[PDB]
Amino acid sequence: PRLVFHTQLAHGSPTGRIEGFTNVKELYGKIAEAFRLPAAEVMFCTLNTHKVDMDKLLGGQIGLEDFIFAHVKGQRKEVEVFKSEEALGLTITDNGAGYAFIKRIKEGSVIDHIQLISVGDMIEAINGQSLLGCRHYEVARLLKELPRGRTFTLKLTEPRK
Amino acid sequence: PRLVFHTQLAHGSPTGRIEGFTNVKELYGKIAEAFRLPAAEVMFCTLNTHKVDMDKLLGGQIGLEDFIFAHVKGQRKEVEVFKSEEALGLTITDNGAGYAFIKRIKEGSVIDHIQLISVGDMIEAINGQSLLGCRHYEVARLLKELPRGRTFTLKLTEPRK
Amino acid sequence: GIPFLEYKHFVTRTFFPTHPLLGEWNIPEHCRPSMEEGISLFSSLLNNKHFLIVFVHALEQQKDFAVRDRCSLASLLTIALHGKLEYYTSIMKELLVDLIDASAAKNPKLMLRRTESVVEKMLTNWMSICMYGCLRETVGEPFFLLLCAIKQQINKGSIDAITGKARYTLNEEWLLRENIEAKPRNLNVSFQGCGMDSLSVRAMDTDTLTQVKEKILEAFCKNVPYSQWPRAEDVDLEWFASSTQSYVLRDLDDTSVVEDGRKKLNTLAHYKIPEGASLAMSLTLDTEKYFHLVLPKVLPEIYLTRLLSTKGTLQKFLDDLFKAILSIREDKPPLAVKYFFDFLEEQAEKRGISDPDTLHIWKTNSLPLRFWVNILKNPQFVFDIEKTDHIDACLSVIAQAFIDACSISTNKLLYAKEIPEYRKTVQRYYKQIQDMTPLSEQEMNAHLAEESRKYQNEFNTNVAMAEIYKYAKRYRPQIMAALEANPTARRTQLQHKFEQVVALMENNIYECYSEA
Amino acid sequence: GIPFLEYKHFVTRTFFPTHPLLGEWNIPEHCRPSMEEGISLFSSLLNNKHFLIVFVHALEQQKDFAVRDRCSLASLLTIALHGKLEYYTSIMKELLVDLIDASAAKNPKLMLRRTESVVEKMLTNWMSICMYGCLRETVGEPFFLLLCAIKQQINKGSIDAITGKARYTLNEEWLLRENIEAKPRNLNVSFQGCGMDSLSVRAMDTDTLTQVKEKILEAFCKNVPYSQWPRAEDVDLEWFASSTQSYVLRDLDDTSVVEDGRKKLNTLAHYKIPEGASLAMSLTLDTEKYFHLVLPKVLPEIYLTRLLSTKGTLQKFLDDLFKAILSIREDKPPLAVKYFFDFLEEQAEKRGISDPDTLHIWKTNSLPLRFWVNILKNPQFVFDIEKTDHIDACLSVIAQAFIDACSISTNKLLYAKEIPEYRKTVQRYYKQIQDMTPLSEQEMNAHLAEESRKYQNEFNTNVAMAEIYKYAKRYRPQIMAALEANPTARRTQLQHKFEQVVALMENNIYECYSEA
């Protein structure tokens, strides 16, 4: 786990590179090393500004503060929907890997009324017609085309919980 | 520059480790690899929550978004200050490397009136008495002790700009 | 087989009005190495007496440090230091002296009357810790049998489901004052393969079916903690009226009657449930809208009679409890009580406070009122049992009698003739303690060290410290001002080691500034 | 040695009401690889005509896409595509046809009258690009000499420092209507080692010292662009009254007079500065409070005389300019003008619009009014020169005369007798262009490709695209709706390649959603 940080002198310099640091004293030493200065010459460090902004003072560790949770495929569902209005009331994106799912369900909508359709549900078929290869905007196109006043069928998959 | 990310399955799993990723499809492949799953099983990823929160969806690169500007010692100054009030109106911290400097100057204060004292100025001496070894709270102590109605002398250093 | 709570829940429930303090820590791995060393360093500070004492005094001089907050710090401290009870006691004694010295102007008889300072709550928690053994080994069983005796006794009569008023009670404000013909019924109830095949449950004519369901749930779950029982609304109830028919019985359905705008809750009498009726149990309010039994100077004799009859039933159980609480088991005497009472007498003499009645008050204000009265009123602190509004109202009368026994001097007429004998018992108790051979600091500290060691891995001290640090943050300059004022704190550079923690917890050395 | 602006500043100043478009990109290294490929892909889209045309039409149907915005897109486009002017012209012609087809209901004589659509601004920028050569090689010098001739001419008389009114002017609203005895003065001024050792600067009796300072700054900086001059308030002025004394001269000091509440600005006359006075220059308003010269049906003859005398002075300079603007240099004819005028005639015939006067209007509305009138009014677009309120008011009169010459039909009486001859010139010009041999698409595109190639690394196209993408974001679903509607856009999956960009620029594939 090696972190690399970009570095300049606040008064103007080329960009130096700095490896991850544990405390603030080590940082100054590393900065001074990369610019060939006695480490006692560094006063303080700022973040994303060369200006003397004390709200942007850097006095702690920097690092990946991100925990990534992955959602696996879980329960398969098949629900009927009666398209009574023009708008089903859902929003569709895709994960950039072929699966398009529900990002939003507008409150009060036709879909919002259906207990067994929740957000993050992958849509696999419309009336048994598979949606493989279908971009999110092509899926939403198919839905709007569907006959208003008739019932259609979705094959879905909830993420496991 | 190697990034390492922490990883769980949203429905519960041990913590796996994942190396930095360029696009979103590569991420799923890496996650599935670390948990021994077919990569087509991953639906989507969230950040810092196991819940199905679409506001916490992860659909881009993660990485160090931080540019570090270092401030070097610059001009040396020596100013006189007449302590007319009880409060000089400045705030003092230190860089965690022996230098204590001015973090704030309260508006309307005695110090705020002096043109040649700005924020981020290192304080090196008080009446020629060096402040080496003096913590920020010991420096502020010395200032408050100073006689009200008399003039004292600061040796300062501005960061270069 | 008394359903005692395990020590960590007992502590949890009496220390606070606390799942976080029994499990793992919620600090993300983002700042985990940072805060790890932060808390570690802060623990060192908290165990430094020259810090902790200033830290508490400083916090107690801030007006916006409310009473609610002061008691939180105390309990947080007791948990943070529960592995170091010797040290903890050392701090409490020091802070108690400070509290006595501050109240040297006021009347001595006013000491420890309420819990409005950090040390006073600390004292209560101290008493909780040291008395838990007494509960487990001596007081708990008579306390529990009494609770059972009360429950059984009240249930021999009708109880209104809405208002909680019953035919029988110790509390005259809870007397069901309708003259209701209550007819007892023996039901033959079965459960879904649970326990025995059929039980003979006793119920009243007048019981709503929720009430009947609760009585059946008791009958099937005697040897089980209440927290594991099915809720009364989680079970259905069928009545085998014959071999051809059975019916589901509810408090409210299509057969419920309306009288003057309100719906009457269904009772066994309503369904005309016969004596001996076989039932089957399975797994499955606005007073202006509903009612049950209450269709809406001096107590008439029959209401007085009923107060007496339930007083009478419970009297041996009650004596047994008060005797357990106010007596010395010669097997193992109350070391912690002797230890503290002697500390009281010691501090009293140092100030020429010799008035026997003042000392009585100090002891009373330290143990019977601090601990025991709240235990009597809250048996849910000690046991895994149901908390019902009415039984609490009975325990209120009993707790009041206890309070009156520890004193020196309309609704108080019920136990009036038992209070003198109780006072004698209390006074005898206090004397018996004053008579048993004194125990050295060494012996007490060995006993405390054992409590610490016994319950090592019960509480998450890190979480406790983390909460304490929040207060330590909110008053950082005040704490700093107070450490600067103290000669010993400055001489040891506690100011540095404090801010060293603040920098770590906040991951920011610039969270440490000074004004001038 | 005319102080022409370099092409990139000329472009910058006429395209917008723009430092970012000449330097480097402000995208942090945080998202730099991300946006790098984003802009790259977006450039491919912008150069896809089947995208760009829909993209512009779609944006122009949104009511909150203001006129100010439409002109910004146009100029952003011209810069984004300045390396592909062949393609850019192709787009402008297509959008111009669409604009003509939309206005097939309205009166033909109303085409291109204002600049309230993307294509109309595009057209103006097109004209700017193609005419810049004319400026550099033919029109610029007479334009500049005229400006000098005006400046020199107005300065032969008093000028009020506050109101800008002068004795001499082309504009009757700017006539100094006080009869001020102006006495010319020849000063002998020196600078701090700059230029020549002593100069003979001519000034008026009545000049404030700021005015005198400006006149001295002109005299010392003839061969230098104005942007490098010292400002008049950046220089001091001493007067060697003798060998024993010298004094600093200011507009305002302890010697300034007050008349009826207001302070009178100091003039040469005020200090009694003698003829021949030696000065030294060195480096160093509320109308109700101050004044200079203005102490506060039909024009009296002397004011008319002064309008005539300055008209007279400038007349040869002015003819020279109008001739340069409205004539064909046989050396190199106006290829781009021929090319576009022919496009006008072509589109006119396709709709049976043959009215000679309508075609005249189309051409007039395409070049003389689009480009030339704004150049006359804003010489600061072309040269590095000072912009003064009064000279602008003179150029206003001249610009008006130009406008009147391109037309077909009180303050307009000054150039009244010259307008007929100018009309003949304009009509002769238009005809001369219609007569020169037509140029093929091939020749035009070769000429455009050369402009593109000449000024390659002048503008930061990335920044230009990045700005365009902001509009592309704000109307993402509308753009998407418009691409879905177009048969050719859907057939080529432009919807994907669009959102592919949006995902990259935003670093978020979930910035791409669809409703249903």
Domain residue spans of chain C: 1-181+299-516, 182-298
b/e burial code for range B12-23 (CB count within 10 A of at least 16 → b): eeeebebebbee
Contact assignment for C510 to A59 by CB distance below 8 Å: yes
B73/A contact by beta carbon, under 8 A? yes
CA dihedral A54, A55, A56, A58 (to 10 degrees): 70
* Spatial separation of the C-alpha atoms in residues D215 and D155, rounded to whole Å: 9
Q: Determine the Cα–Cα distance for residues C321 and C215; give it in Å rounded to an integer.
A: 26
Q: In the CATH scheme, what architecture does the domain C1-181+299-516 have?
A: Orthogonal Bundle (1.10)
CA torsion through residues D259, D265, D271, D274, sign: negative
Is the dihedral angle over the CA atoms A27, A29, A31, A34 positive or is it negative? negative
Residue ranges of C 155-214 with Cβ closer than 8 A to chain B: none
- Asked whether the domain spanning D182-298 has the same topology as the one spanning D1-181+299-516, the reply is no
CB contact (8 A) between residue B122 and residue A43: yes
Handedness of CA D68, D70, D72, D74 (dihedral sign): negative
Q: Return the DSSP state at C300.
A: P
The answer to whether the beta carbons of residues D167 and D358 sit under 8 Å apart is no
CA-wise closest residue to D510 among B53, B20, A125: B53
Pair C263, C257: CB distance under 8 Å = yes
User: Residue D38 is encoded by which pair of tokens?
Assistant: 């984003």
Strands of the sheet containing D257-259, edge to edge, are D257-259, D262-264, D290-291
Sequence length of chain D is 516
Taking one residue from B and the other from D, the number of pairs with CB-CB distance under 8 angstroms is 26
Q: Is C245 helix (H, G, I), strand (E, B) or coil?
A: coil
Method: X-ray
Contact A25 B49 (CB under 8 A): no
- Which chain D residues are within 8 Å of A91, Cβ to Cβ? 513-516
Tokens 């472009």 found at: D11
- A67: chain C residues, CB-CB within 8 Å: 28-30
Chains that touch B (3 or more CB pairs under 8 A): A, C, D
Contact B103 C480 (CB under 8 A): no
**Nearest residue to D443 via CA among D332, D311, D278:** D332
Place of tokens 């060293």: C500
> CB D503 to CB B63 under 8 A?
no
The CA distance from A96 to B25, in Å, is 6
d(CA C329, CA C134): 10
Pairwise CB contact (< 8 Å): B67 & D28: yes
Find out whether B156 and A6 touch, Cβ atoms under 8 Å.
Answer: no
Q: Under a CB-based contact definition with an 8 Å cutoff, are residues D455 and D449 in contact?
A: no
Which residue numbers in chain C precede an interruption (C–N > 2.5 Å)?
17, 284, 296, 409
Distance from CA of D4 to the nearest CA of A (A): 34
C-alpha D91/C-alpha A8 separation (Å) is 44
Burial class (CB in 10 A: 0-12, 13-18, 19+), D454: exposed
CB contact set of A154 (below 8 Å; sequence gap of 6+) = A77, A78, A79, A81, A117, A123, A125, A126
DSSP codes joined into one string, B50-106: SS--GGGB--S------EEEEEEEEEEEEEEEE--SS---EEEEE-SSS-EEEEEE-
Contact between residue D226 and residue D386 where contact means Cβ atoms under 8 Å apart:
yes
The verdict on a CB contact (< 8 Å) between B139 and C514 is yes
Let me know: does B45 contact B57? Beta carbons within 8 Å.
yes
User: What is the residue whose two structure tokens read 């950039």?
Assistant: A96
Q: What are the tokens at C176?
A: 């069901």
* Mutate: best of D29, D36, D499, partner B, most B CBs <10 A: D29
Given an 8 Å threshold on Cβ–Cβ distance, is A96 in contact with D503?
Answer: yes
Q: Give how far Cα C458 sits from Cα of B136, C4, C17, Å.
A: 40, 17, 19
User: What is the span of the domain harbouring residue B154?
Assistant: 73-159
Q: What is the β-pairing status of strands A67-82 and A151-159?
A: antiparallel
| Beta strands A151-159 and A122-126, pairing class | antiparallel
The residue among C102, C54, C222 whose CA lies nearest residue C151 is C222
Residue appearing with tokens 């390492």: B4
Judge whether C133 and C377 are in contact, CB under 8 Å: no
* Residue B159 with chain A: CB contacts under 8 Å: 10-11, 43-44, 52
Residue D454 to residue C328: CA distance in whole angstroms: 107
Within 8 A of D511 by CB-CB distance, chain B residues are 59
* CA C480 vs CA C472, C475, C489, C512: distances in Å: 10, 8, 10, 10
Residues of B in contact with A27 (CB under 8 A): 68
Chains touching A (3+ CB pairs < 8 Å): B, C, D
Contact yes or no for A2/B20 (Cβ under 8 A): no
d(CA A15, CA A34): 10
For D162, the token pair is 């506050």
Would you list the DSSP string of chain A?
Answer: ---EEEEEETT--PPEEEE--SSHHHHHHHHHHHTT--GGGEEEEEES-SS--GGGB--S------EEEEEEEEEEEEEEEE--SS---EEEEE-SSS-EEEEEE-TTSTTTT-TT--TTPEEEEETTEE-TT--HHHHHHHHHHS-TTSEEEEEEEEEP-
d(CA A84, CA A76): 25
Measure CB to CB from residue A49 to each of B9, B69, B70 and give the nearest one. Answer: B69
Q: Side chain identity at B139, as an amino acid letter?
A: V
- Partner B contacted by A57 (CB < 8 A): yes
> Which structure tokens are listed for D462?
């990335």
CA distance A152 to A128: 10
D237 burial type by CB count under 10 A (0-12 exposed, 13-18 middle, 19+ buried): buried
Work out the minimum CA distance from C458 to partner chain A, whole angstroms: 29
d(CA C234, CA C258): 26
Burial class of residue D358 in the structure, from the number of CB atoms within 10 Å of its CB (0-12 exposed, 13-18 middle, 19+ buried): middle
d(Cα B95, Cα A57) in Å, to the nearest integer? 10
| B6 to C29: CB separation less than 8 angstroms, yes or no | yes
Are the C-beta atoms of D458 and D7 separated by less than 8 Å?
yes
* SS3 of residue D228 by DSSP: helix
Distance CA D264, CA D160 (A): 12
Distance CA A28, CA A49 (A): 17
Cα D450 to chain center, whole Å?
24
- The answer to whether residue D495 neighbours chain A at the CB level (below 8 Å) is yes
Please report residues of D whose CB lies closer than 8 A to that of A94: 509, 512
- CATH code at B109? 2.30.42.10
- D509 contacts in B (CB within 8 Å)? 24, 59-60
Residue D52: its H or E element: helix D49-60
Chain D residues with beta carbon closer than 8 angstroms to that of A90: 515-516
B157 contacts chain A (CB < 8 A): yes
- Number of CB atoms found within 10 A of residue C62's CB: 13
Whether B140 sits inside 8 A of C516 (CB atoms) is yes
Q: Is the CB of residue D430 less than 8 Å from the CB of residue D368?
A: no
* Closest residue, chain B, to C512 (C-alpha): B93
- Per-residue burial over D261-270, b if 16 or more Cβ lie within 10 Å, else e, is ebebbbbbeb
Distance (Å, rounded) from C-alpha A23 to C-alpha A34?
17
Give phi and psi for C207, each to the nearest 5.
-70, 130
> Which chains does chain D touch, 3 or more C-beta pairs < 8 A?
A, B
Contact call for A72 and B37, based on CB within 8 A: yes
H-helix or E-strand containing C204? strand C199-204
- Phi, psi (5° rounding) for residue C85? -65, -25
CA closest to A6 among chain D residues: D29
- Quickly count helices (H) and strands (E) in chain C: 19, 9
Q: Which residues in chain A have Cβ-Cβ distances shorter than 8 Å to B52?
A: 71, 118-120, 159, 161
For C:7-66, CB contacts with B below 8 A are 28-29
Interface check for D507 against chain B (CB to CB < 8 A): the answer is yes
Structure tokens at C27: 């600090």
Q: What is the architecture of the domain spanning C182-298?
A: Roll (3.10)
Bridge partners, A156 (sequence order)? A77, A123
Alpha-carbon dihedral angle through residues A66, A72, A76, A80, given to the nearest 10 degrees: 30
Q: Retrieve residue B124's tokens.
A: 């090196």
Determine the residue among A88, A92, A93 to mutate to test chain D binding: the one whose Cβ has the most chain D Cβ atoms within 10 Å: A93
Contact across the interface for A60 and C30, Cβ inside 8 Å: no
Resolution, given in Å to one decimal, reads 3.2
Contacts for D399 with CB less than 8 Å, ≥ 6 apart: D373, D376, D377
Question: What length does chain B have?
Answer: 161
The first and second tokens of residue A25, run together, are: 């004293």
The reply to whether residue A72 touches residue B97, judged by beta carbons under 8 angstroms, is no
Helix axes D49-60, D67-80, angle to 10 degrees: 160
Burial code (b: 16+ CB inside 10 Å, e: under 16) for C400-425 equals bbbbbbbeeeeeeebbeebbeebbeb
Which token pair is C414? 């019920």
The tokens of D181 are what?
């005895």
**B86: which chain C residues are within 8 Å (Cβ-Cβ)?**
none
Hey, what's the torsion of the CAs at D305, D309, D315, D317, to 10 degrees?
A: -150
CA distances from C314 to C310, D94, D432 (A): 6, 102, 125
D38, C274, C512: which is closest to A24 by C-alpha? C512
User: Measured between CB atoms, which of A10, A31, A47 is closest to B159?
Assistant: A10
Q: Which of D385, D439, D449 is nearest to D5 (CA)?
A: D385
User: Is residue B47 helix, strand or coil?
Assistant: strand
**Under 8 Å between Cβ of C44 and C85:** no
Contacts of C106 (CB under 8 A, 6+ apart): none
Rg (CA), chain A: 27
| B87 Cβ under 8 Å from any chain A Cβ | no
Q: What is the phi/psi pair of residue C386, to 5°?
A: -70, 140
Chain B CA closest to residue A34 = B70
- Cα(C74)–Cα(C92) distance, rounded to whole angstroms? 10
